[PDB]
């Protein structure tokens, strides 16, 4: 099994010893330190993170095939902005070309994960078809002087859609059929993105020096860009389909062929609802929402909330639980003990992975902890509370401490208050010293 | 102290290196069952890959072209096969898609030069790729130079198989052909791989570059078994496992090599150094300098 | 039952001349204290006085640890493959108490040998594969197979009652066997030390 080892080579290059890191928190201490020597105290050796318990996918409300079936035979390939917009609805997702991928020429997605489109339901998806050549496919991406990169739609980071382009020499013409789509070059009245205003105005009056001195705003050009057919190798066509995926409130009409799995509450799952995916724990709405804000991504670029594609509920999704591994361990001049504080959890869900694993026993090599002490910094496993306190030894936090005093295991044993197994306790502030005002 | 010259060595045995198999374009075929020759005991001419840096795609890993004239290696293999352009780029950390990652693959951890050029001619029975078949996924860790015959389903999807039958719920089998130029990304290339093998035991393949054999005890740049560094070359001062004779320090540098002419291990000790601390009076007077 | 991997089964991940240094690496090593599974040649009826046994065809998952002991070379080798139907590529390792034969082609094995029969007046050395495990229409290819190869192991030991540990894995396209040879006093024990 691929596990990290801290290997020791002698003079000869001969491996004489090694520590298997993903064995016991003590081995993690040594792997963290990069030494076989551990000194008395507490180390951060790793972190525990709950692993996914389920991958929830959803099946459509209506089964049909998506009508992609007419636009790769022969159809309209309008402009680069005005698109052969075909509505996709009421079907089993045929977004499956992104899911298993192709090879593409353009594979740029924003707002949706392309590889999980068969998990993710949509309300409406528009398939926007056009054909463009090499020198124009480059203009999809921002920046670089061009004729379409510099106007209107590029592919912004906040785009809800995927741009799919691949190498095919099938399908030419029919792009120049646009004339009810025109927008300004020179303007005095501003330019709003993607205007369909074919207007009427006339002037010879410029802004900068005009009329014989190569001025600006001396003309009123209008523009709407198509595609040039391939007239030599190098003018290579590519077929581009842009999928505009509606993540907005409405019941889902399109999802993948995979069988519905319903919501699994208070377990770590892989989720993907209304464009919002990630690894997290599903619950239901406690947060206030506007009907226009029924899904959220926070400043951290993670899911905050999402509206459910099949039900009418808004879900609150909080990323899966994790916490520090703080190991209480002595020196290596004495037998080693391992008590682990599982940062900021209760002592009822103490597993490393809850209803999941890391291809290793539920804890790490154990499937149970034992000696579970609920502290004010999390839950301490491998140490039990005793009613015999000290003015601390190894501090844990929040008045909680442990001590190891060659007690033939102290943070690796059950509690006694009648024998030397004085392990973990709330610290005392010394003793009282009697005095009275006189 | 700056290096005085670089040291380039010749081996104990110096014959001709039979690189013809791939430089005369004898046959390209069979990516995992190569037409190849072993290069050992000899003075290599890397003339092809020294005076040309053009071709179609020329990417060396571990080394860059026109460097082979300085480096010695333990063995060099002259390998050949034909793949398509979309596949050529997959030797390098290339792209996703069903073009696949496994159609040979050569990470820089392994030194080699992979040269794509198109003069496809004389390669028989390469159109269809048959006589071998290999998997994209398997249970015994897929690596190149592997052949598989599938009897079991690979079931590893993000959503579990035997129900939704998604991604990695199929039987991969692969054996890639090529067909002639027609357009862009439709173009085959003949691929020559020279695999430069860096192992324990003395280097046996060196370039025709100047004989600096057994020049020692001064600060030089050495090119010993494809590993380079700067220092002062003297006899080894430590014990060894015979399998481990060419060094890697904390800095991933080499301190130790097995000598290509003798049977000895040669250790390279770093060049003389010390800080200079300059003491000077002021400009009230002349500027006297004493240097520690 | 099982025994444990008592902080052993570590192989060299590299061949570089290290000295007195730690490295943290990760690769297909034998996990410490893992369960190592014992197999015995389980007796089945229809003995015929031949000492009949069965043997399943054992999963190979992400590389294996393999070990065996020898008293009289009763183990003639081992075979890596898939279903082993002589209609599938396999590695046949022939010890036959002599020099190792490396041969990769379409082979089978069951639990019934034909010419792999324990020596008395048979074999005592054979440098060829068993010819009674081909079922024809062969199509196999190789360029790195050489039959008189790895006589640095041999299929026979100088002394017996030793343990030979092997790890079989595929790394960088190389079929790697790393091994260690150590004495034992009894076949029920395996080393408590670092290997």
């Amino acid at each position: 099994q691929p596990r990290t080892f801290l290997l020791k080579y002698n003079e000869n290059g001969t491996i004489t010893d090694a520590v298997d890191c993903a064995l016991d928190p003590l081995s993690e201490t040594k792997c963290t330190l990069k030494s076989f020597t551990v000194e008395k105290g507490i180390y951060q050796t790793s972190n525990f993170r709950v692993q996914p318990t389920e991958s929830i996918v959803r099946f459509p409300n209506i089964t049909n095939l998506c009508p992609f079936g007419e636009v790769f035979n022969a159809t309209r390939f309008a402009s680069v902005y005005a698109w052969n917009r075909k509505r996709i609805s009421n079907c089993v997702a045929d977004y499956s070309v992104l899911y298993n991928s192709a090879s593409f020429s353009t594979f740029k997605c924003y707002g949706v994960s392309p590889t999980k489109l068969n998990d993710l339901c949509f309300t409406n998806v528009y398939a926007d078809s056009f054909v463009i050549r090499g020198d124009e496919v480059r203009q999809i991406a921002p920046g670089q002087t061009g004729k379409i990169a510099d106007y209107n739609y590029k592919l912004p980071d906040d785009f809800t859609g995927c741009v799919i382009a691949w190498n095919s020499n099938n399908l030419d013409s029919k792009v120049g059929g646009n004339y009810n789509y025109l927008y300004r070059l020179f303007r005095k009245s501003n330019l709003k993105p993607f205007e369909r205003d074919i207007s009427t105005e006339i002037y010879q009056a410029g802004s900068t020096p005009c009329n014989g001195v190569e001025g600006f705003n001396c003309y009123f050009p209008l523009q709407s860009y198509g595609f040039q057919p391939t007239n030599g190798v190098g003018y290579q066509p590519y077929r581009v389909v842009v999928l505009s995926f509606e993540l907005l409130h409405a019941p889902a009409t399109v999802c993948g062929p995979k069988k519905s799995t319903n919501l699994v509450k208070n377990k770590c799952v892989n989720f993907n609802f209304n464009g919002l995916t990630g690894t997290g724990v599903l619950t239901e709405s406690n947060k206030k929402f506007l009907p226009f804000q029924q899904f959220g991504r926070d400043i951290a670029d993670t899911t905050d909330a999402v509206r459910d594609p099949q039900t009418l509920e808004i879900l609150d999704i909080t990323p899966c639980s994790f916490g520090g591994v703080s190991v209480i361990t002595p020196g290596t001049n004495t037998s080693n003990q391992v008590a682990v504080l599982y940062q900021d959890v209760n002592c009822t869900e103490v597993p490393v992975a809850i209803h999941a694993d890391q291809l290793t026993p539920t804890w790490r090599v154990y499937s149970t902890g034992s000696n579970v002490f609920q502290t004010r910094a999390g839950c301490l496993i491998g140490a039990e509370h005793v009613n015999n306190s000290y003015e601390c030894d190894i501090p844990i936090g929040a008045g909680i401490c442990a001590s190891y005093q060659t007690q033939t295991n102290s943070p690796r044993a059950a509690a006694s208050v009648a024998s030397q197994s004085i392990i973990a306790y709330t610290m005392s502030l010394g003793a009282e010293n009697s005095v009275a005002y006189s | 102290v700056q290096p005085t010259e670089s040291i380039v060595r010749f081996p104990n045995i110096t014959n001709l290196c039979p690189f013809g198999e791939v430089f005369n374009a004898t046959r390209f075929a069979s990516v995992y069952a190569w037409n190849r020759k072993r290069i050992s005991n000899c003075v290599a001419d890397y003339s092809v890959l020294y005076n040309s840096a053009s071709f179609s795609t020329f990417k060396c890993y571990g080394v860059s072209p026109t460097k082979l004239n300085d480096l010695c290696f333990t063995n060099v293999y002259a390998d050949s096969f034909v793949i398509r352009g979309d596949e050529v780029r997959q030797i390098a950390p290339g792209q996703t898609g069903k073009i696949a990652d496994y159609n040979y693959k050569l990470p820089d951890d392994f030194t080699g030069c992979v040269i794509a050029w198109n003069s496809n001619n004389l390669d028989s029975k390469v159109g269809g790729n048959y006589n071998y078949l290999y998997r994209l996924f398997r249970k015994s860790n897929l690596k190149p130079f592997e052949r598989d015959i599938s009897t079991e389903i690979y079931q590893a999807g993000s959503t579990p198989c035997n129900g939704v039958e998604g991604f990695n719920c199929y039987f991969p089998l692969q054996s890639y052909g090529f067909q002639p130029t027609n357009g862009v990304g439709y173009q085959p290339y003949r691929v020559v791989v020279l695999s430069f093998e860096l192992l324990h035991a003395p280097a046996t393949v060196c370039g025709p570059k100047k004989s600096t054999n057994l020049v020692k005890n001064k600060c030089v740049n050495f090119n010993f078994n494809g590993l380079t560094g700067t220092g002062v070359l003297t006899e080894s001062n430590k014990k060894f496992l015979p399998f481990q004779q060419f060094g890697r320090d904390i800095a991933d540098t080499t301190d130790a090599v097995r000598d290509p002419q003798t049977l000895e291990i040669l250790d390279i000790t770093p060049c003389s150094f010390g800080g200079v601390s300059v003491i000077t009076p002021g400009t009230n007077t002349s500027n006297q300098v004493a240097v520690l | 039952a099982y025994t444990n991997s008592f902080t052993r089964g570590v192989y060299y991940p590299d061949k570089v001349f290290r000295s007195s240094v730690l490295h943290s690496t990760q690769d297909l090593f034998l996990p410490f204290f893992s369960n190592v599974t014992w197999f015995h040649a389980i007796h089945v009826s229809g003995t015929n006085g031949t000492k009949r046994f069965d043997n399943p065809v054992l999963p190979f998952n992400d590389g294996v640890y393999f070990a065996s002991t020898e008293k009289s070379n009763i183990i003639r080798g081992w075979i890596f493959g898939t279903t082993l139907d002589s209609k599938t590529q396999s590695l046949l390792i022939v010890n036959n108490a002599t020099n190792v034969v490396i041969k990769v082609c379409e082979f089978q094995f069951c639990n019934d040998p034909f010419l792999g029969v324990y020596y008395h007046k048979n074999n005592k050395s054979w440098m060829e594969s068993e010819f009674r495990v081909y079922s024809s229409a062969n199509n196999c290819t190789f360029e790195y197979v050489s039959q008189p190869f790895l006589m640095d192991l041999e299929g026979k030991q100088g002394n017996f009652k030793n343990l030979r540990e092997f790890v079989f894995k595929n790394i960088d396209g190389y079929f790697k066997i790393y091994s260690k040879h150590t004495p034992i006093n009894l076949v029920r024990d395996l080393p408590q030390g670092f290997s």
Partner: nanobody
Amino acid sequence: QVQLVESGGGLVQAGGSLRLSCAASGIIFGRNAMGWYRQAPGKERELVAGITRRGSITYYADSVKGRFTISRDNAKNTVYLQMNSLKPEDTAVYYCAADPASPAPGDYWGQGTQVTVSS
């Protein structure tokens, strides 16, 4: 890879056999093995059966939706897809693509061919 050419298919009854022809670029056509991929939800992009490069070991996914044959001959090979014991569920639009390949609608690696296991 895009650019599959399909042929064969047609109107067949259940059982019997149906062979598909294809042509494709060398990255597909020249493979010693090609499989079955089809579109039509219920059996969607499923590869359920196939056969070895040599020998006659025929395998299938534990869904048992037939045991098909990949016709190949290691002597200037191209692949024909032979389906045996067609079931009503084998009605779909089919692509003739390499085994790990996944042709599917949305970009259409060719237009496929229709196999109808009915009149």
